[PDB]
Design an enzyme around this catalytic site. Structure first.
Site, short mmCIF file in Angstrom:
data_model
loop_
_atom_site.label_atom_id
_atom_site.label_comp_id
_atom_site.label_asym_id
_atom_site.label_seq_id
_atom_site.Cartn_x
_atom_site.Cartn_y
_atom_site.Cartn_z
CG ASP A 116 7.96 -11.34 20.29
OD1 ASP A 116 7.72 -10.90 18.88
OD2 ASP A 116 8.44 -10.78 21.12
CB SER A 176 -0.77 -0.05 1.01
OG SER A 176 -1.61 -1.15 1.00
CA LIG Z 1 8.43 -11.04 16.53
#
Ligand SMILES: [Ca+2]
Ligand SMILES: [Ca+2]
Lengths: 525, 196
Positions: free
Chosen positions: A76, A1
């Site tokens: 994460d 974008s």
């Molecule tokens: Ca990460």
């Protein structure tokens, strides 16, 4: 974008400008939904992703807004240490803990219906996404926005209702997912925010890799919004973005591969810096360039030219190639709509690049290219390849300068030999047939949502919609396009809505419809 | 053309874009959901099924693994309801009104299916269900989370491990640092640090 915001000093008219270009693919019915919303004290026109009760690309009475994906580090992976005696237990803060267990039933259409059952697991860190049973490990996934997606919806609704920088910035501070937000208002202000909730990570871990999940390396809250990259009325007078890095010291861990020295936002930088004050027509010319640019030209075509010039006394074919490369405007465009890209040398350059990338990395990374080709030949840039070929400092010595120069030359000779064999010696004979695309039935969510469209259009490295907005004293003004069409309805008898694909021609031909805001104009559109 | 759905005036322009004129936000956001469903009901249905992991009920075994991933990483209705319960009361009410608007069209379409249910529902032989505010959050999550969610940390661990076992640790570490850098200080930026 991509996105641009232009402040009053860089605008020809002295009015702030905004340009939107979200890249969410091309489907029919479209990924976006355009609407006008009008109640007391709330007037807004623009589009949002399908199903969203808010506008993301457009303007209210006071401000225009858009967004691009942030690519900030909000996911994460935790490496859970499993109990060798019980694979549903993991070690965390000094004790074995039980995974949460969930049984899910899936009804599958044959053919009659089948009932499949699967078991899913959660740890303190989040859902278990992967197992390495051979290492007694499970991988769990932590999102910084887990459970706050509705708060992000509320923040976007507040952005719609906002009337000034302070209110917009308050909404921005509440958004928990990783986006760039762009703002322009009728007072001339512009503003940029890298929104999202960014965790405070352990300083003992390398954030490019999974974090051990045993409890010593947990997140320690989220940083204040004031620490998110952001600027109101930056001195340069404008902001451009094509998913590139917000600010020099802002990091995004495992996904740094998108924020390198060679980055596609250079097309927007080049276009704004080549001009003085700009208007919406200029912004459209910059979008056109970005949409058709061969992105490797910015750094790699000068390197190729310089190399060929060192040897054009030896190889009589190189002077011709240099002349053709120099005159080429770096685009793969089809201005006469004859179905072939206009510059024959672009076909040579494409093949040169493919050959060069392979020679650079096949003999070291070939064995891992199932994971690394997507990095070294990334759609946003090829930073490592550029550093190797230009002799700039790298951690590993991939190629000597002599070896790098030989790669450039060999790639040239091979590409030219193939073109001479199959097409001829004049660059005009090398012109490649254009790549086309359709607005199909399956979006990025990877499931069918309709029947698509068979209308073929040239491929463009371009937003799925575009708005061009000027915040005049009276009201937002400008123009936009939202292909393929507003209405996705197909009648049982097969009749398509008259508005199923009536914006495809606008999109394909760089034409637009007026941005409507005044009710008197809406009634006559 | 201009039309009136309840107390909201709906003006559709020459490209079919609806412009809604309401006396308050509750009415506006119901009309918003309604016109979106008028225009896109099958798409809304399938996007919701994507998030719920029920696409394989319509399109078969090819989407089972996708359905499984969506449920693995997703939320229960109760969990989403708890999210909604944490919003400002006015915001929650407007999301409920938006779902009521979608539902209003669903009810109209199922009562007049040959004229108002789109061809895909007839071809695939099923009916759209009514909507709750939790389903509006599912529509948001199915698309926005795509831009946030990745497992590159796992790919990076595999890159490093595969380089190590063939080239040794010292060389593998240097190669990886060039592939996935900590911070490229020459990367073009949207703002400069003095602008913060
Ligand atoms: Ca990460
Ligand atoms: Ca042509």
């Amino acid at each position: 974008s991509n996105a641009m915001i232009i402040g009053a000093k860089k605008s020809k008219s002295g009015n702030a400008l905004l340009f939107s270009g979200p890249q969410v693919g091309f489907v029919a019915p479209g990924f976006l939904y355009e609407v006008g919303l009008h109640s007391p004290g709330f007037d807004m026109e623009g589009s949002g992703f399908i199903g969203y009760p808010f506008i993301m690309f457009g303007a209210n009475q006071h401000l225009a807004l858009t967004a691009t994906a942030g690519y900030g580090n909000v996911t994460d992976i935790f490496e859970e240490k499993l109990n060798p005696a019980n694979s549903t237990q993991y070690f965390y803060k000094g004790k074995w803990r039980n995974m949460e267990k969930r049984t899910e039933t899936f009804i599958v259409r044959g053919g009659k219906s089948k009932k499949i059952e699967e078991t899913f697991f959660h740890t303190v860190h989040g859902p278990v996404i992967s197992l390495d049973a051979a290492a007694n490990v499970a991988y769990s996934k932590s999102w910084s926005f887990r459970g706050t997606e509705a708060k992000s919806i509320q923040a976007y609704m507040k952005a719609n209702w906002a009337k000034n920088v302070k209110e917009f910035q308050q909404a921005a501070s509440e958004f928990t997912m990783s986006l760039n937000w762009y703002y322009a208002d009728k007072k001339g202000n512009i503003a940029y925010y890298h929104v999202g909730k960014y965790p405070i990570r352990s300083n003992q871990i390398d954030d490019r890799f999974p974090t051990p999940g045993t409890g010593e390396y947990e997140w320690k809250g989220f940083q204040s919004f004031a620490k998110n990259p952001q600027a109101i009325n930056p001195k340069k007078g404008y902001v451009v973005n094509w998913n590139n890095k917000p600010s020099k010291y802002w990091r995004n861990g495992e996904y740094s591969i998108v924020w390198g020295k060679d980055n596609r936002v250079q097309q927007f930088i080049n276009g704004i810096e080549a001009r003085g004050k700009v208007d919406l027509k200029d912004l459209n010319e910059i979008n056109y360039t970005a949409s058709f640019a061969q992105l490797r030209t910015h750094y790699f075509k000068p390197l190729l030219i310089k190399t060929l010039e060192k040897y054009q006394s030896e190889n009589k074919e190189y002077a011709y190639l240099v002349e053709q490369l120099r005159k080429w405007n770096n685009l793969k465009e089809d201005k006469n709509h004859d179905g072939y890209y206009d510059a024959g040398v672009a076909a040579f350059f494409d093949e040169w690049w493919n050959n060069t990338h392979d020679k650079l990395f096949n003999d070291s990374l070939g064995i891992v290219s199932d994971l690394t080709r997507e990095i070294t030949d990334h759609r946003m840039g090829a930073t490592l390849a550029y550093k190797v070929l230009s002799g700039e400092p790298t951690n590993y010595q991939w190629k000597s300068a002599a070896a790098a120069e030989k790669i450039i030359l060999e790639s040239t000779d091979e590409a030219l030999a193939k073109l001479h064999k199959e097409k001829g010696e004049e660059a005009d004979k090398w012109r490649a047939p254009i790549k086309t695309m359709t607005f199909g039935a399956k979006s990025l969510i990877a499931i069918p949502h309709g029947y698509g469209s068979k209308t073929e259009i040239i491929e463009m490295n371009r937003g799925s919609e575009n708005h061009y907005i000027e915040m005049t004293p009276k009201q937002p003004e400008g123009f936009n396009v939202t292909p393929p069409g507003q209405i996705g309805f197909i009648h049982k008898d097969g009749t398509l809505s008259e508005h199923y694909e009536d914006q495809l021609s606008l999109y394909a031909n760089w034409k637009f419809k007026p941005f409507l805001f005044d009710k008197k104009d809406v009634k006559r559109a | 053309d201009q039309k009136k759905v309840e107390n909201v005036t709906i003006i559709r322009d020459s490209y079919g874009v609806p412009h809604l004129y309401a006396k308050n936000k509750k009415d506006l956001y119901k009309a918003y959901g309604y016109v979106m469903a008028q225009d896109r009901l099958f798409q809304l249905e399938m996007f919701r099924r994507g998030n719920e992991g029920t696409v394989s009920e319509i399109f078969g075994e090819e989407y089972v693994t996708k359905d499984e991933q969506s449920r693995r990483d997703g939320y229960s209705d109760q969990e989403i309801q708890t999210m909604l319960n944490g919003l400002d009361r006015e915001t929650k009410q407007l999301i409920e009104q938006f779902a009521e608007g979608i539902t209003a069209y669903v009810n109209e379409a199922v009562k007049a299916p040959d004229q108002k249910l789109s061809k895909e529902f007839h071809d695939y032989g099923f009916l759209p269900r009514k909507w709750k505010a939790t389903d509006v959050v599912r529509l948001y999550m199915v698309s926005m989370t795509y831009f946030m969610d990745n497992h590159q940390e796992l790919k990076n661990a595999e890159i490093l491990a595969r380089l190590e076992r063939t080239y040794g640790k010292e060389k593998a570490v240097k190669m990886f640092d060039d592939l996935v850098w900590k911070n490229d200080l020459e990367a073009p930026t949207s703002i400069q640090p003095d602008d913060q």
